[PDB]
Write a protein that binds this ligand. Sequence first.
Ligand SMILES: Nc1nc2c(ncn2[C@@H]2O[C@H](COP(=O)(O)OP(=O)(O)O)[C@@H](O)[C@H]2O)c(=O)[nH]1
Ligand SMILES: [Mg+2]
Length: 181
Amino acid sequence: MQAIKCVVVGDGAVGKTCLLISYTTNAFPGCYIPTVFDNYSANVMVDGKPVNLGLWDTAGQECYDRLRPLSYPCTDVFLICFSLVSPASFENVRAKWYPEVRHHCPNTPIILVGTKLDLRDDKDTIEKLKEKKLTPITYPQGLAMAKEIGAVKYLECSACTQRGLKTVFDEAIRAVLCPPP
Ligand SMILES: Nc1nc2c(ncn2[C@@H]2O[C@H](COP(=O)(O)OP(=O)(O)O)[C@@H](O)[C@H]2O)c(=O)[nH]1
Ligand SMILES: [Mg+2]
């Protein structure tokens, strides 16, 4: 029936691959590639609506700044990801990922995703940031960024515990099925 293309962007090490693997397949060996004959699209059904959600991961490296935008054509929604325990990835949304997604696709919906939510309350992770004079991204800080980039939604998730993870992909679909003109 309905086809929705979703592209995930954001810094290396923020959890983009793990977010996709954890949502589609659980377990370390699940780590799938598009070459898998089983399928690439996802079988999702919401409020009686049959949606085939195609998921695309991205090489976040500076080297592939020329090759990564080739997957941007015909994207219905973007997930812009930053790690909630990395302030550098957060400011890379401001300086790189939002300008890049907007330059190539001016009218496509953006969902801002705060990743690694489980590590925001982690005592060791918090101490290690504090040593470098850094702190985790709070819900007000992430919501503030979402407003600055005019994102359709701000969501926080963990791929590791699966907290809020399913909600991210459900909202990606709702951004396309219930837009604003
Ligand atoms: N605690 C924790 N670690 C995570 C989560 N997601 C990814 N990671 C870890 O973060 C690192 C980067 O993950 P990956 O998905 O490859 O990053 P990508 O470069 O953005 O794709 C790996 O060491 C993962 O195990 C998470 O939700 N919680
Ligand atoms: Mg990756």
